[PDB]
Amino acid sequence: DIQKQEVREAVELPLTHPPRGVLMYGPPGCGKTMLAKAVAHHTTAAFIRVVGSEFVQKYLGEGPRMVRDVFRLAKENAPAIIFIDEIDAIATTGADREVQRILLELLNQMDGFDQNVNVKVIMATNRADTLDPALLRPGRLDRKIEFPLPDRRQKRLIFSTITSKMNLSEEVDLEDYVARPDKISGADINSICQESGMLAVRENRYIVLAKDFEKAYKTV
């Protein structure tokens, strides 16, 4: 609802036509692949998918040449929505600090490309306690987009954005199923709804009910 619309209006609306740094967060929800693939289907361009730990090797001069060549085909061919995953691991160990200063080097190379430039630098993470304060500095990452997990509001918002995609009976409840995580600590409510799809996918029942919501709450 608000995540696909914030990432959508922050990526594809400035793509062919003012932020550009879309930072995906949220450690409860796995995520980070439904939006990369959804972008890989809605937009038809070149995508250099990089798990992050792909350019950590003996070499030191090869990294900048790799991001500069991928940036020359990204800067030459199309507004590549290149997806950098798990920056928290490579954001803190001489190799890791080495790709940390390298990470600030490419963050300066997007600082030279203020915005509306040919190509775009999206970003994904799940741990913000290890992220440098210079990474989330405004002007660099102007959009801090969360995975809907804060207990009070965005839990119901992600209930709405997951009920907008999948089937639904009127048995879908919110009070006991958002106040239960308020009493006992729980995570990945979206992935627990997906587990309810993994218990209603047994082809016995045609419409999902709350027996797999509470049964998913007690089993997983």
Binding site: H17, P18, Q100, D132, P133
Partner: protein, 229 residues
């Protein structure tokens, strides 16, 4: 134009000797927009101290770099030094705020004594930004030998007509807009509300597919930044 105009004949003078400058006022915006926008018109690097965590490990591990920062400023001969993180209302106890702030006031004391001591390259500059009794402590410490003094007004209405004009020359704007009520409808606490109405209103000018930004759009972005404030 009242800040960049006064700042051009000091910053841009050794470009196309003043030792430092201080900026006082409520903790809004204009201390970094001026130093980094005019440092950006200088085409020079921007060297920050920013005493905090992860910087005593990231930029140097056991180096206070009070001279090594002038070695990085010696190799990077065009440079502008500015204190940004220390400008906070938290250093108000006048004991640990004045001691912890007095370590950086001493740092810029020995730095101004290095610029007065000798010069290895030109364009070396330092910019201060504080608002507390520490301002009066700096006036007790500055015996007024080598320092430049430039008045920095707070983000008032007169600091919004000119920053709205300078920050409105960049993008398109209609001529039938009143530059008084739209400046008065963005009260206190920064100028980044003005720059957020301009820059965040250009996305509504592109959304509406208009070639020029209208006054109703600036009002819309005023309401949008006032929903966030």
């Amino acid at each position: 134009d009242k800040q960049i105009k006064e700042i051009k004949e000091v910053i841009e003078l050794p470009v196309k000797q003043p030792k430092g400058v201080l900026l006082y006022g409520p903790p809004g915006t204009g201390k970094t927009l001026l130093a980094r926008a005019v440092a950006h018109h200088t085409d020079c690097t921007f060297i920050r101290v920013s005493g905090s965590e992860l910087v005593q490990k990231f930029i140097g591990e056991g180096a206070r770099m009070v001279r090594e920062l002038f070695v990085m400023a010696r190799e990077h001969a065009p440079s502008i030094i500015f204190m940004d993180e220390i400008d906070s209302i938290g250093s108000s106890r006048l004991e640990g705020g004045s001691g912890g702030d007095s370590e950086v006031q001493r740092t810029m004391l020995e730095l101004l004594n290095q610029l007065d001591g000798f010069e290895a390259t030109k364009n070396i500059k330092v910019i201060m930004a504080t608002n507390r009794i520490d301002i009066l402590d700096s006036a007790l410490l500055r015996p007024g030998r080598i320092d430049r003094k430039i008045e920095f007004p707070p983000p008032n209405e007169e600091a919004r007509l000119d920053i709205l004009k300078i920050h409105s020359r960049k993008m398109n704007l209609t001529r039938g807009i009143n530059l008084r009520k739209i400046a008065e409808l963005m009260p206190g606490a920064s100028g980044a509300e003005v720059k957020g109405v301009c820059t965040e209103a250009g996305m509504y000018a592109l959304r509406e597919r208009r070639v020029h930004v209208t006054q109703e759009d600036f009002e819309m972005a005023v309401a949008k930044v006032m929903q966030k404030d």
